[PDB]
């Protein structure tokens, strides 16, 4: 998201400790910082080329991916910079020896590097609690 | 029997919460503060006993105070304190100046005195010497132990260059 508005907040957005110098001549105009989370998740080129600033982004922001790595179907693109996915499963009831369709809707942060829609399968990795409900972050879109 | 406490400006009784270092309160646990009653600092006919201290002698010697005089139960026990209780110099061997207490147990007229503290004695300087020396000893024991490691890699580059000039 972030819809083409770079400096839209009351406060100035910048990455912490990433200093651009006005004295020197430069063809970048923003020393950018980035990393590869690991585990085989390619840092999307849109993250490195991107103009946005996201503190919660797993590639450009100050957050690490450790713990479970899950996958789910996106169900809600309504909130800004976040989505709700519905991870389905089937619960085994021993007495009847059969299953029942269950589900859970976990919220996860979505960095502006990825552009999603509802109905797309996506992989998210657990991170440090970044909100009241969000505990995961999007790392790769299968769809 | 409620005692008064300075700095209240009250001729009546009140109840306050006291802590350590405060008057009319001896704590019984760590960080323990208990609310107790206290009488004001302004004298009143309700007081049963007033406590006062003389600050100037009068015209006639009092019944038993200006006449009588009692001595200080203890004497200086810290070396520099004896020095300044007798206006002594810093080299007069105070151990001879520590006042004794002649006492008896029958014909056991013994003389006991306090263990003067903070005195400069051989053992004290032995300890200071030992510490001030041990410090520098390790100070460079580790500098040498550091150079030996520096050499381990200084000559591990031996193979970083001999396996480069041997293949």
């Amino acid at each position: 998201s972030t819809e083409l508005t770079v400096q839209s907040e009351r406060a100035f957005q910048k990455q912490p400790h990433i200093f651009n110098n006005p004295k020197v001549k430069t063809s970048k105009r923003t020393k950018r910082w980035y990393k590869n989370a690991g585990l085989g998740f390619k840092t999307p080129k849109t993250a490195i080329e991107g103009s946005y600033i996201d503190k919660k982004c797993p590639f450009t922001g100050l957050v690490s991916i450790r713990g479970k790595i899950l996958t789910g179907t996106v169900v809600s693109t309504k909130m800004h910079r976040t989505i709700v996915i519905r991870r389905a499963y089937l619960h085994y009831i021993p007495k009847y020896n059969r299953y029942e369709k269950r589900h859970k809707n976990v919220p996860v942060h979505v960095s502006p590097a990825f552009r999603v829609q509802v109905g797309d399968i996506v992989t998210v990795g657990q991170c440090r609690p970044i909100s009241k409900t969000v505990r995961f972050n999007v790392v790769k879109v299968s769809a | 029997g409620f005692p008064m406490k300075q700095g209240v400006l009250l001729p009546t009784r009140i109840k306050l919460l006291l802590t350590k270092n405060v008057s009319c309160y001896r704590p019984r646990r760590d960080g323990e503060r208990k609310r107790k009653s206290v009488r004001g600092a302004i004298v009143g006919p309700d007081l049963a006993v007033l406590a006062l201290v003389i600050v100037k002698k009068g015209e006639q010697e009092l019944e038993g105070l200006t006449d009588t005089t009692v001595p200080k139960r203890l004497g200086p026990k810290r070396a520099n304190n004896i020095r300044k209780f007798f206006g002594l110099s810093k080299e007069d061997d105070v151990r001879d100046f520590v006042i004794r207490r002649e006492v008896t147990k029958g014909e056991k007229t013994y003389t006991k005195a306090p263990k003067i503290q903070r005195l400069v004695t051989p053992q004290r300087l032995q300890r200071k010497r030992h510490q001030r020396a041990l410090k520098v000893r390790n100070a460079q024991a580790q500098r040498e132990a550091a150079a030996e490691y520096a050499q381990l890699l200084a000559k591990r580059l031996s193979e970083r260059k001999a396996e480069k000039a041997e293949i």
Partner: protein, 260 residues
Amino acid sequence: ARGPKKHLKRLAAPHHWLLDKLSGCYAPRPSAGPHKLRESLPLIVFLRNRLKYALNGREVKAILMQRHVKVDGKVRTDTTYPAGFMDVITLDATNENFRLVYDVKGRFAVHRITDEEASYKLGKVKKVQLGKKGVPYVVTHDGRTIRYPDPNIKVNDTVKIDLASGKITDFIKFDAGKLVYVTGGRNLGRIGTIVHKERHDGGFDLVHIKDSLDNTFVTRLNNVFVIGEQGKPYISLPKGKGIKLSIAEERDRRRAQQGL
């Protein structure tokens, strides 16, 4: 629960400790030290259960207060001292020296050693990183840190220590085909020298171990402890040398030595 729990009820004590059930109501809580609580053994247990040296626990302290016992060096008179795996328990009296090594069943066994062998010990390096004013250090299973180690000394590798001083002499590495000792789960005690490692980036790399009986098994990395070269250990192993005798095998040869 408001702080540190300083008790240990019975039935909560480690099973490999071999504590009888009805002996009152509590076990001795191991103290804080070099080895993890659930991964150790205290002196009271050693001197009372394993060696039957002291009858009461009251007697154990009387024994220790005379400086008779020393472990890995110094006296260590803490009745609840957490003596752990590979520690060396010397004994001024009786000239005895012991090394703490497991069985194949998983418990610590009494293993006497030479006065010569009592001078050293090993340790699985658990961490290696730079520190104070750039000097690198190593911390291992032991719970001791050694400054200025060799730049080839990586993590998970075993190391030999003098114990007269701190510096290490040799350092075996975690490479395919090196003597190992399983300390974890109940495969703990088995020995067999390496099969291969499954990295599994993210955590819990798994080790494949083949005993020298053509028997395979698997465990997790932090449970394997390299000890040297195939058939060539670096310490005196215990009887049976960890090869997982089957229940039928041990009962068969238990009835083998039949006549007295």
